[PDB]
Amino acid sequence: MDIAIHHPWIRRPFFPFHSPSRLFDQFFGEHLLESDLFPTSTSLSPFYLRPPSFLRAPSWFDTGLSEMRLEKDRFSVNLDVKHFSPEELKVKVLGDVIEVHGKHEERQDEHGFISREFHRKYRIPADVDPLTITSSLSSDGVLTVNGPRKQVSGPERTIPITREEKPAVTAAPKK
Amino acid sequence: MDIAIHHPWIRRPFFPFHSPSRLFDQFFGEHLLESDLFPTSTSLSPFYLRPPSFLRAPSWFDTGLSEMRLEKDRFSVNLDVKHFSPEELKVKVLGDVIEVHGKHEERQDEHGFISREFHRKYRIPADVDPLTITSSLSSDGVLTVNGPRKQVSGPERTIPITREEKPAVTAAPKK
Amino acid sequence: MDIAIHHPWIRRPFFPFHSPSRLFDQFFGEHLLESDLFPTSTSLSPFYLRPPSFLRAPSWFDTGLSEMRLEKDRFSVNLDVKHFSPEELKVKVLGDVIEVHGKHEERQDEHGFISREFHRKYRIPADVDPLTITSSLSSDGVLTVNGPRKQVSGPERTIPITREEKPAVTAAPKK
Amino acid sequence: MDIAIHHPWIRRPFFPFHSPSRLFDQFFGEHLLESDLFPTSTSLSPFYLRPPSFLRAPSWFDTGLSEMRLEKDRFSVNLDVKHFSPEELKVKVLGDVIEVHGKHEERQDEHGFISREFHRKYRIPADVDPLTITSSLSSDGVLTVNGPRKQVSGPERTIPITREEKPAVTAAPKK
Amino acid sequence: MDIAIHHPWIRRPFFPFHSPSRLFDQFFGEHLLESDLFPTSTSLSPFYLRPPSFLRAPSWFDTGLSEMRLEKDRFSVNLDVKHFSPEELKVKVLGDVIEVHGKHEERQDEHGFISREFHRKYRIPADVDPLTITSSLSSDGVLTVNGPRKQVSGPERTIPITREEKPAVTAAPKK
Amino acid sequence: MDIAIHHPWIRRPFFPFHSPSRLFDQFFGEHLLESDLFPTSTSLSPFYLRPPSFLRAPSWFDTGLSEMRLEKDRFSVNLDVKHFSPEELKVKVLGDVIEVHGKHEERQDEHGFISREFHRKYRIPADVDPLTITSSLSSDGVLTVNGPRKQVSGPERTIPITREEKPAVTAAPKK
Amino acid sequence: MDIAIHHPWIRRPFFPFHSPSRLFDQFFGEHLLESDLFPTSTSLSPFYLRPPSFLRAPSWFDTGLSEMRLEKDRFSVNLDVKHFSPEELKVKVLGDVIEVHGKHEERQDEHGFISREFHRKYRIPADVDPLTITSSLSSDGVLTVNGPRKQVSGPERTIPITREEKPAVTAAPKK
Amino acid sequence: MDIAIHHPWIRRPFFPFHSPSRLFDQFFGEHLLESDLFPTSTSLSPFYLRPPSFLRAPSWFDTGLSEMRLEKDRFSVNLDVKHFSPEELKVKVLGDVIEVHGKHEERQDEHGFISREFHRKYRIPADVDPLTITSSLSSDGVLTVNGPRKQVSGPERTIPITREEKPAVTAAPKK
Amino acid sequence: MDIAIHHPWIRRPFFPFHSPSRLFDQFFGEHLLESDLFPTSTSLSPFYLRPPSFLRAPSWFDTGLSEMRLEKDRFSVNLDVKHFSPEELKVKVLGDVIEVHGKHEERQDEHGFISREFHRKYRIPADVDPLTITSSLSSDGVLTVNGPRKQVSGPERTIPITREEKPAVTAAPKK
Amino acid sequence: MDIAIHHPWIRRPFFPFHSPSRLFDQFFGEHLLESDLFPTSTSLSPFYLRPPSFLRAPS
Amino acid sequence: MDIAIHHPWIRRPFFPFHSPSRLFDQFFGEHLLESDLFPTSTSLSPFYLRPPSFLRAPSWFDTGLSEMRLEKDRFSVNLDVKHFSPEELKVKVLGDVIEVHGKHEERQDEHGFISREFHRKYRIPADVDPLTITSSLSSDGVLTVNGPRKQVSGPERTIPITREEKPAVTAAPKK
Amino acid sequence: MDIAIHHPWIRRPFFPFHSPSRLFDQFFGEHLLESDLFPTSTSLSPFYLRPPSFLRAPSWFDTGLSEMRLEKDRFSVNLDVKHFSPEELKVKVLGDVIEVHGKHEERQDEHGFISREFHRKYRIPADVDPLTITSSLSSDGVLTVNGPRKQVSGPERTIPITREEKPAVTAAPKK
């Protein structure tokens, strides 16, 4: 990371984008925090944020959409368990996440027994609904979770706590 | 002060008071300087500095009041000189400050003479006016600075001189 | 450069100018860049930069008139070649810059020949025009460039390049 | 820290106490360890440590008393559970510590259920005796622990184990 | 040396010995120096020093004994000279130290002569006495120092000179 | 660790052993890795490693043997439980490791009960076989694990995994 | 470049690719230098370097081929000059590199004339041969270099000089 | 010793001498140590060492010869003593080294006597042989050591001791 | 102060002055100290110092003159006191220094009185003589100091004391 | 070519007499030239010429 | 450099030369500059410099002579061009320096032509005079420059400009 | 030695002693070396060094005298040996230094014999002359060295060898 090369070079194809306020992360952060309080006469927004764009005719907004749903219908998803494991399989419908845990010993040796296991992790919210979504097992291991759908999920960890106006602290000189 | 403890800790209860503009001392300082020039349609105030408060209903303003006057009426006031010192006492009325300096030798030893002294320092502007405040002495030392009242005082040292439009300076490289 | 003297002293005859926006070079720089795009209802100005002045009655603007032309009329300029050098002189009219290069050997020694040279550099835009401005030589060396005038010039090197909307660069941690 | 101020100042109102043996923590520590072995001819002492005092007439001894017992009598303390939680409450009598854990959902919303909880922590040794102290619950949640008393407790963590006559270790130069 | 391991560990099996006076080398050193002057009321002592022991019933004293003599009687020690060297051997009785130096060339080669040598160093004070102890040589080299015995010796170098009451010397500040 | 003494001294008695290939740990390590793949026409070895020996006549090989078995026959090992604890003892045969855990309270005080415990840890592979080795308890606590034997064991942690042929990584200059 | 992360992580995926001789660049470099002298009994080699591969069945050799020729046939390449520039174009056949330099002013303004230029850089050795390859221009600017082909080229700068087997130097200690 | 000049310049004429094995002092040192043990099938060698040479036809070997003898026959060497000193001269034949020490006072002053001395140091092995080589003196000081010859000598100090195969040392971590 | 620029540059236009004796301040200082003792055969000198000059024909000397007197006559200087202050003015004739101190309150406000003051400092030796020079005041404040003159003054502080024949000190090694 | 070693090490011994100018061998040289070409102590020694000049006072 | 050896050792064979004035380069440099101005009654001198010699009888002077001319007469020097190259040769008489540049291709290969070139560099001033010295070529390449001689030359670069009486520079404290 | 006190204070009493030539040790050293060669027209001196004195009337010179002789006559010095030691005494007349070494055992103990010894060291050149001075012993130990005298001596080590004439040494840059 030659500071005498990478610094002036990584700033070369940046000019036409520069002048975006030395405090861009806070400037726009405030405007996005204002529209996140009350529907500010906009076409509403789950979290649409007005970003700096070169587009002159249209107004672009940062959104998701392609991160929740996509291509689905009535459906009847099927889990994968190549080899049957009726008693050695456990299907779990934890919310909008369908998983299958089947382990069967099909390979055998002298004094060593091999055990294969198939584990599927389906995070399909627009395909699963804990209530109606059920499960049907076959004799070959072919698991099939049938049922309607329509919904979005996704476990994240973005919950800033504390900071709530009023309280404060203080200090004093020392060393 | 453990920088790895006091810093993140002293910055905890501060949450509800955070986001007070990184330049709070200058930002509000300018607004207070603007209202200190001409009575800006305010309820008239010597130095009502509008500070950041959590009060939603009422508007708070920084003021004095409880640092000038309090409980006074007509009065006569009385200095303290337990032991008489008619010729050895000097009462001074320096403005809104009444003081008494009386020293009398009441205790005596072999070759050592003891001398007691009573010195009172009164900073009562609300009940002292050098122009009309007199002094009366008793035969026991009881001093009484009778007279009218009503006034405010207090010697401070806040007079930032210099800087007054159109100066100009300069400099040059060095090594 | 006693930092404990020159710093607090140089910051003395500057108070009356102080508080001129810690970012004065960028603040006004933006306002000057805005008026440099389209004639903003001003009295029209190639580069009239509204600067901070103490003048309360009139509005001052940074000019440049006294750096183009001044005292000219409709005559002929005369180059200097005290000693004749008809064949040894070359007059060049490079734009608004009239120059003369004449070298003649008038002083002679034993085995050493002295050669004097007269070189004039005239940057008179309001007096020269490569088209009409001609040149007439005398028998004594007196060169005289005759012709009309009226024009402004001056070779400078202030042409910032690049920085054209739509770039973008990036980087990453290092060690 | 102002080592050139706090050091000589924090040692100012300390003179009249100075000369307390540079090794005060060990000197007196030995005398207190001697009286902690065998009941030395004194008015006994649970841990009364003869400290350096200015009292000339009486002899002061560091003691507790006001850290075990205070104001108690034939009682029947009662825990606090404003809202009834018969099946949702658990009273625990862990030694001289009476605690109550009751949680009941009294506030309800659309799809969110609120649950309040009352938890009391009583460390009353002179009021509790796990052997006899019982508990009686009311229909409103008013828990009442009835029974005799008289006792002292308090969980601490001061138990030095190592060191026990006849050890010996060794070492040698290194680099 | 692992100051963060060997230090706290080398101080582990040492606690039961700890508190042996930070100045143990000087404290006891003084008491041993006092009993080294005049035969203090004791069972006498060549250099018996009362050391800190865990023995409660008996009183231990640091002594020698097993460093002077041991198992001896009317003797006639014999030196070792496997091969005869009557003219090439020199026996020396330097105090309580009997030594033998015999060198004989028994091995021969082409142009190289080998010479074997036997050197014994006997520091037997309880077996030797310069006066009486004589020497007798055999024809095979068997040397035999005959004579009585009883005596103690041992060349050491512990003679701390200097410091002898009333000296006087000083210095002064410098830089 | 005087590097100016220990270094040249610890390299003195190494003199006649020096020159053992500066990369002895890798040189021989390779030859031992080659014989650890396929029985290389040797007298069959479990892990015999040809080490640098001074023996000229015989060829020495690093071996174990005295770290697996020693002196056994048919046996019927006996555990130790001085005091009976039929209900308070638990014998465990975890592989080739026989252990006994018996705790009985034989000593009693006023309000304090003493409990002694006997725990044996036997790692005898050539004496134990979990499949056949049983356990018999006596009325005095004398435990006796009877049964055949012959076997080798020993829990170690030497399993350097991964190095799955065909990997490779990459990097680049930084700062 | 976290040396405590990248280093161990840039050597992990390297895992089974290691053991390639700490001096791989010199070891193989010598074997490649030996086969570069005399055509060693092989299927010849322009510069085929036997590299370390995991291929067990076949023997891989570092080669070029796809860096000289590819898809060519009896041709007549055509240069690009969208707008005609008969007198303002210069075709140059510098070896196996065909280039065209044509500049024509098609766009005109008030006092500013625009001039477009088309410059092609062809490095086709298997398509060009200075001798036969000629050029034909059209009236629209369409240049066409016709002629046979078959050849390989490529200007590189890999020519180490000196190391004239048979020299010498020395030098001496200094400071 | 400009490291940025002498280093790359001193290795410059070393150009064609490079690649002499980074461990040339040890590599060849082993081969020379192997031929120094048993007379390996060669034209023998007093200490000839096969060195790296550019000679292609002949094989060069590091030898001495011109460091032992050179031009001698029967001879009768003569020492130098310009002025006679029969009684004041001492001739010494220490092996293959003939020396003469003669001092005579020929110059005299007032109270100071001058004494000249002639000392010759002859290290002629091929000319001297302690046994037969005698000495003859003349009346003028001309010394003459007559006798046969033929021999080689030269006192050096190259005798590496110790490394008596079969030692070993050890150490341990410290700090 | 670029030492790599200002140093060689500040020494550039100094060459034609260089070689002025590295100890010019002491060399000439001695010659000037010699002519300051006894009136050496010259045109005398109050303090004329022969400096290094380029003047070849005339001899230049460092003089004063223009720092004592200039253009004066009989005269009768006048002080300045725009507004009359008969009782509020004090004229002081301290040697060759005439000063006037007059303060009069001409401007008045509500409760604030303004007082103007005129203070002149005349250091005219060739115009003042304490003895004769008197003062005359007018009714408008016009002060006039009349009287003769002729003399020079000027209070400076250049009096090096000590270094009074034969002193001597001493020292010694320390650390 | 130790520019960061010899350079500051050679200008060090010059300091005892370094401060005036960068050129010390031409002013004192010409100053002695105009003083040596003049009969000082001894007497006589001339020879010159005279070309056209613009100077009126000198020549 | 062994400052502790080379410094005291180098200063050994220099004592008998010592005391040559710590400023020898400037002391003598001044005396040589004085004799370089006007013929100082010496036996003339091109640049003879009186150096410090040990010769007591004669006076030595640093001179050249053996660096201008040596052994010449009145002949014709001849350049060297082994193989004829009339059309491909260029003789240049640049002052007192005669040079020849002839290149002829005599060796030929398959597709490679070898070209030999002979270049002589003669700096003979006492043998060359551009005015008269001519050149004559032979049919074999034998070039012969004929003509008189007698002259001295030698291109050097010793022209220290600047410094010329009457300069002066200045500076000031900085930081 | 506080450099901020001792330095300016140790140079204070040096005030009028200064100006003794910064190179006083060399300046006068040369003048003293000149008068040490040939007897320069003076009152003759052995080593009289004209030093800087404040004496105006007389001329002082550094001299010895009081360091060679003082008060002597015919004389017959006598050594001291309180107790007779005829056979146990040795008188040595080493030049102008008379010494006596007598040791006699006069004090006796049990097994310890005390021995007294008297050793005189006389460095009297003006009283001793090895040639004539003899020695006469008495029966009580009174030694008496009788004889004439008149002479000067004194062993010193001031012989600076080396620093001859014409040596020559050199060096070169390094790093």
Give A5-8 contacts, CB < 8 A, sequence gap 24+. Answer: A6/C171, A6/F175
Distance CA D62, CA L26 (A): 81
Is A174 part of the contact surface with chain D (CB cutoff 8 Å)? Answer: yes
Phi, psi of B54 (to 5 degrees): -95, -5
Closest CA relative to residue H86, chosen from H135, H137, H133: H137
Closest alpha carbon to J25 in B166, F23, K164, K7: K164
Q: Residue B166 to residues B161, C12, C19, I76: CA-CA distances in angstroms?
A: 15, 12, 12, 41
Structure tokens belonging to residue H84: 């006679």
Cα gap I163→I161, rounded to integer Å = 7
Contacts of F56 in chain H (CB under 8 A): none
C-alpha I161: how far from its chain's center? 21
What is the gyration radius of the CA atoms in chain L, in angstroms?
Answer: 27
Tokens 């060497």, residue?
Answer: H77
Q: Does K59 touch chain I (CB under 8 A)?
A: no
Beta-bridge partners for D116 = D104
CB F151 within 8 A of CB G4: no
What's the burial of J8, exposed, middle or buried (CB within 10 Å: 0-12/13-18/19+)? exposed
How big is the CA angle at G175 (ends G174 and H3), to the nearest 5 degrees? Answer: 85
CA atoms within 13 A on the CB side of B120: 24
Question: Does the domain spanning F75-153 belong to CATH 2.60.40.790?
Answer: yes
What HEC string does D32-94 produce? Answer: HHHCCCCCCCCCCCCCCECCCCCCCCCCCCECCCCCCCCCCCCCCCCCCCCCCCCCCEEEEEE
Q: Supply φ then ψ for residue J49, to 5 degrees.
A: -140, -175
Q: What does the alpha-carbon distance between residue L29 and residue B91 come to, in Å, rounded to a whole number? A: 82
Chain I residues closer than 8 Å to K34 by CB = none
> Identity (one letter) of the amino acid at F13?
P
> What is the Cα gyration radius of chain G?
27
Residues of D with CB below 8 A from A175's CB? 1-2
Any binding-site annotation on I31?
no
K31 to chain J, any CB pair closer than 8 A? The answer is: no
Alpha carbon distance D76, D134 (integer Å): 9
Chains contacting C (3 or more CB pairs within 8 Å): A, B, F, G, J, K
d(CA L37, CA D56) in angstroms, rounded, equals: 92
Q: How far apart are CA I150 and CA I152, in angstroms?
A: 7
Total number of residues shown for chain D: 175
From the list G165, G167, G175, the residue facing H13 with the nearest CB is G167
**Half-sphere exposure of C71 toward its Cβ, with a 13 Å CA cutoff?**
0
- Say which residue the tokens 């100006």 belong to: L19
Taking contacts as CB-CB distances below 8 angstroms, the residues of chain H near F15 are: 162-164, 167
C-alpha angle C168-C170-C174 in degrees, rounded to nearest 5 = 165
A167 in Cβ contact with A153 (< 8 Å): no
For chain C, list the strands marked E by DSSP: 76-78, 89-94, 97-108, 113-122, 136-137, 143-146
Asked if residues L149 and L143 have their Cβ atoms less than 8 Å apart, the reply is no
Give the count of beta carbons closer than 10 Å to the beta carbon of residue B54. Answer: 10
Does H3 touch chain G if contact means CB atoms closer than 8 Å? no
For chain A, say whether D4 makes contact (Cβ under 8 Å). Answer: no
B111 and chain K in contact, CB less than 8 A? no
Report CB contact under 8 Å: H167, F11.
Answer: no
- What does the alpha-carbon distance between residue D154 and residue A97 come to, in Å, rounded to a whole number? 50
> Contacts of residue K4 in chain G, CB cutoff 8 Å?
none
What single DSSP character describes residue H143?
E
Query: CB-based contact (8 Å) between I2 and chain B?
Result: yes
Cβ separation of J22 and I12 shorter than 8 Å? Answer: yes
E strand or H helix that includes residue K148: none
| Neighbour tally for L49: CB within 10 Å | 15
Q: Which residue, among H8, L174, K4, has the nearest Cα to G172 in the 3D structure?
A: L174
**Contact indicator for F71, F123 with CB cutoff of 8 Å:** no
CB atoms within 10 A of CB I22: 17
Q: How far is L9 from chain I (nearest CA, A)?
A: 9
Chain K residue nearest residue C3, CA to CA: K175
Check contact C-H (3+ Cβ pairs < 8 Å).
no
Cβ under 8 Å to F: C residues 127-146: none
Record the resolution, in angstroms: 20.0
Distance CA C102, CA C137 (A): 11
Determine how β-strand E97-108 pairs with β-strand L143-144. unpaired
CB L94 within 8 A of CB L125: no
Q: How far away is chain E from the Cα of D35, in angstroms, using its nearest Cα?
A: 18
For residues F94-104, b (16+ Cβ closer than 10 Å) or e, as one string?
Answer: eebbbebbbeb
Position of tokens 């299907």?
A91
> I55 at the J interface (CB within 8 A)?
no
Please tell me the distance from the alpha carbon of residue I72 to that of residue I128, in angstroms, as a whole number. 11
Amino acid identity at H77: V
Pick the residue of D161, D163, D175 with the most E CBs within 10 A to test the interface with E by mutation: D163
Closest-approach residue (CA) in chain K for G174: K1
Taking Cα atoms as reference points, which of C1, B172, I13 lies closest to residue K170? Answer: I13
**Residue E102 dihedral angles phi and psi, to the nearest 5°:** -125, 130
E25 CA: distance to closest CA in chain D (Å): 16
When computed from its CA atoms, the radius of gyration of chain D, rounded to whole angstroms, is 27
Q: Is B91 helix (H, G, I), strand (E, B) or coil?
A: strand
3-state secondary structure of K89: strand
Q: Taking CB atoms and an 8 Å cutoff, what residues of chain K touch I54?
A: 165-166
Chain B hits for C16, CB-CB cut-off 8 Å, are 163-168
Cα separation of C136 and I84, whole Å? 75
**Which residues, including other chains, have CB under 8 Å from residue L86's CB and lie 6 or more apart?**
L137, L139
CA–CA separation, D77 and J21 (whole Å): 100
Geometric angle at alpha carbon H167, from H164 and H173, rounded to 5°? 140
The three-state secondary structure class of F99 is: strand
Determine contact: H172 vs chain E, CB below 8 A. no
Tell me how far apart the terminal alpha carbons of chain L are, to the nearest angstrom.
38
- L41 to A108, B4, B122, L55: CA distances (angstroms): 127, 88, 96, 22
**CA closest to C110 among chain J residues:** J49
Distance from CA of F172 to the nearest CA of A (A): 10
Local structure of L33: helix, strand or coil: helix
Beta carbons within 8 Å of K149's beta carbon, 6+ residues apart: K72, K74, K124, K126, K127, K128, K129, K133
Contacts L173 to J, Cβ<8 Å: 2, 6
Q: Which of K1, K23, K32, K38 to mutate to test the interface with J (most CBs of J within 10 A)?
A: K38
Distance between CA atoms of K103 and K86, rounded to whole angstroms?
9
The answer to whether E172 faces chain L, any CB pair under 8 Å, is: no
A164 touches chain B (CB under 8 A): yes
Tell me, what DSSP letter sits at residue H136? E
- A173 → chain D, closest CA residue: D1
Of the candidates G112, G48, G120, the one whose C-alpha atom is nearest the C-alpha of residue G91 is G120
Rounded CA-CA distance E153/E67 in Å is: 10
